Design a protein around this motif. Structure first.
Motif, PDB file in Angstrom:
ATOM      1  N   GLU A   1       0.821  -1.209   0.000  1.00 11.55           N
ATOM      2  CA  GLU A   1       0.000   0.000   0.000  1.00 11.55           C
ATOM      3  C   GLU A   1       0.857   1.263   0.000  1.00 11.55           C
ATOM      4  O   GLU A   1       0.808   2.071  -0.939  1.00 11.55           O
ATOM      5  N   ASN A   2       1.653   1.449   1.055  1.00 10.57           N
ATOM      6  CA  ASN A   2       2.475   2.648   1.159  1.00 10.57           C
ATOM      7  C   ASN A   2       3.501   2.718   0.040  1.00 10.57           C
ATOM      8  O   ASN A   2       3.811   3.809  -0.451  1.00 10.57           O
ATOM      9  N   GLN A   3       4.038   1.572  -0.376  1.00  7.10           N
ATOM     10  CA  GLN A   3       5.053   1.576  -1.421  1.00  7.10           C
ATOM     11  C   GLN A   3       4.469   2.039  -2.751  1.00  7.10           C
ATOM     12  O   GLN A   3       5.102   2.816  -3.474  1.00  7.10           O
ATOM     13  N   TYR A   4       3.257   1.592  -3.089  1.00  8.34           N
ATOM     14  CA  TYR A   4       2.642   2.071  -4.321  1.00  8.34           C
ATOM     15  C   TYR A   4       2.221   3.530  -4.210  1.00  8.34           C
ATOM     16  O   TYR A   4       2.267   4.256  -5.209  1.00  8.34           O
ATOM     17  N   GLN A   5       1.810   3.980  -3.022  1.00 12.23           N
ATOM     18  CA  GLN A   5       1.555   5.407  -2.840  1.00 12.23           C
ATOM     19  C   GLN A   5       2.816   6.209  -3.137  1.00 12.23           C
ATOM     20  O   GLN A   5       2.780   7.222  -3.850  1.00 12.23           O
ATOM     21  N   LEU A   6       3.948   5.751  -2.604  1.00 10.87           N
ATOM     22  CA  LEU A   6       5.215   6.433  -2.831  1.00 10.87           C
ATOM     23  C   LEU A   6       5.584   6.425  -4.309  1.00 10.87           C
ATOM     24  O   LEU A   6       6.054   7.437  -4.845  1.00 10.87           O
ATOM     25  N   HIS A   7       5.382   5.290  -4.983  1.00 10.17           N
ATOM     26  CA  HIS A   7       5.703   5.221  -6.403  1.00 10.17           C
ATOM     27  C   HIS A   7       4.846   6.183  -7.209  1.00 10.17           C
ATOM     28  O   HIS A   7       5.339   6.839  -8.132  1.00 10.17           O
ATOM     29  N   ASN A   8       3.549   6.253  -6.905  1.00  9.73           N
ATOM     30  CA  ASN A   8       2.678   7.165  -7.636  1.00  9.73           C
ATOM     31  C   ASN A   8       3.100   8.609  -7.415  1.00  9.73           C
ATOM     32  O   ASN A   8       3.111   9.412  -8.359  1.00  9.73           O
ATOM     33  N   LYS A   9       3.462   8.958  -6.178  1.00  7.14           N
ATOM     34  CA  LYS A   9       3.933  10.312  -5.905  1.00  7.14           C
ATOM     35  C   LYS A   9       5.193  10.622  -6.705  1.00  7.14           C
ATOM     36  O   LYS A   9       5.313  11.694  -7.312  1.00  7.14           O
TER      37      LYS A   9
END
Lengths: 136, 168, 136
Positions: C60-68
């Motif tokens: 979850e957090n890792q994909y949020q970071l990637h999208n950012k």
């Protein structure tokens, strides 16, 4: 004669089209080629001075000389006065694209006034002797 | 001796500045706003006067006019006079502030004719409170500095005349 | 926070209009103020990085970071990339006239990627923290 060399140096100057004819009042262009092969680059600066050279002769010769100097001074104008030719690295050539415009009709064979100053030994070589401008 | 309550100004902010710093393109004229507020809670100022005085007017000794010819004297002194009058100027300043009122006034910085050492500006203001209708006005001083830097732009370093001789 | 200074140095940076709102697709201009008062002129060079920063965290957090990071990477482009700010002499200021154009609608508060490199001590200060671009 058309190929003019520099005293106390090895550089060489030559107009690509040393003979040009054009109607009075139309700006024309002359491509001045510089050959440098001595040791090092230079910062030579070309300028046309539109000032009557003071005269030194009977009155006839004196007035002939004054008329010649006046026609030289205020006949042609260089639209890139006090130009700074950027760099001429050793064993390489360069084109100084000079731009003029004539205002007084005549035959300016071997035009004076156009003289190039070398800012290394204060040379005042008369580079303008390789020009045969004829403005109607 | 005891005087009545006096006010104070804080220099709340300036619009297009960062600690009173700016750049000018040496010919363009700009303007910006100055915001000040009267700290006092009781009485406010009835007298404001703006007198800008920059470095070059500050950094010329009192005896400059002794040994100079009339022509260069006129040129330099005309430049100084224009710089005193027609330089950085105030438009639409207030005339009465109220206690704890954050008043804003404009300021036009016009430098079409300034020399190439105009690096400095020391706008100083003297607000004052009228006394109790007795004989005088109690003035104060506030000397905000500005460090403007002047770039270089188009300049003419030579000239000629070469009169015409023939019609075209 | 909006005003950002340089570590191990005294130069300081501020955008004139840190809060800019423009229609997406249109190119806009952002005026960056440089303050120099330390000792000597600087040769800082500014660029925008358009590469996805590698990720280092749950999915979850890792994909949020990637999208950012993707949105930062391919959202804005600086149309004067690798601009050599010429000279900033001591106790003076200068206006780096950066020029941008956006391609993804969104709110780029404290935009990263716009980082300025100092070619005296390899400072990689994040100058973009004082920018709050919003584009529809």
């Amino acid at each position: 004669t058309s190929l003019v060399n520099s005293k106390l140096s090895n550089v060489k100057f030559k107009f690509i089209n040393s003979n040009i004819k054009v109607i009075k009042g139309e700006k024309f262009t002359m491509r001045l080629q510089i050959i440098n092969s001595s040791s090092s680059p230079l910062d030579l600066v070309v300028y046309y001075n539109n000032t009557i050279n003071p005269i030194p002769l009977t009155l006839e010769n004196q007035y002939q000389l004054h008329n010649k100097y006046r026609k030289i001074a205020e006949g042609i104008i260089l639209l890139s006065n006090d130009y700074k030719i950027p760099v001429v690295p050793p064993r390489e050539t360069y084109f100084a694209d000079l731009r003029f415009i004539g205002i007084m009709s005549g035959y300016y064979g071997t035009l004076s006034g156009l003289k190039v100053l070398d800012l290394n030994t204060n040379e005042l070589i008369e580079v303008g002797n390789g020009a045969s401008v004829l403005i109607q | 001796k005891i005087l009545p309550e006096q006010p104070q100004l804080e220099l709340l902010s300036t619009s297009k500045m960062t600690r009173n710093s700016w750049m000018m393109l040496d010919g363009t004229k700009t303007d910006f706003h100055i915001t000040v507020r009267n700290k006092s809670l009781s009485c406010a100022i009835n007298h404001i006067k703006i007198i800008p005085m920059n470095n070059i007017e500050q950094m010329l000794k009192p005896d400059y006019w002794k040994k100079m010819p009339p022509d260069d004297l006129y040129i330099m002194e005309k430049q100084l006079d224009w710089l005193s009058k027609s330089c950085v100027r105030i438009i639409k300043l207030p005339t009465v502030i109220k206690p704890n009122e954050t008043i804003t006034f404009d300021l036009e910085l016009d430098n079409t004719a300034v020399p190439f050492n105009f690096t400095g500006f020391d706008l100083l203001i003297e607000y004052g409170m009228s006394a109790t209708d007795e004989s005088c006005i109690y003035l104060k001083k506030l000397s905000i500095p500005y460090e403007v830097t002047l770039r270089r732009t188009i300049e003419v370093p030579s000239m000629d005349i070469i009169p015409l001789n023939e019609l075209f």
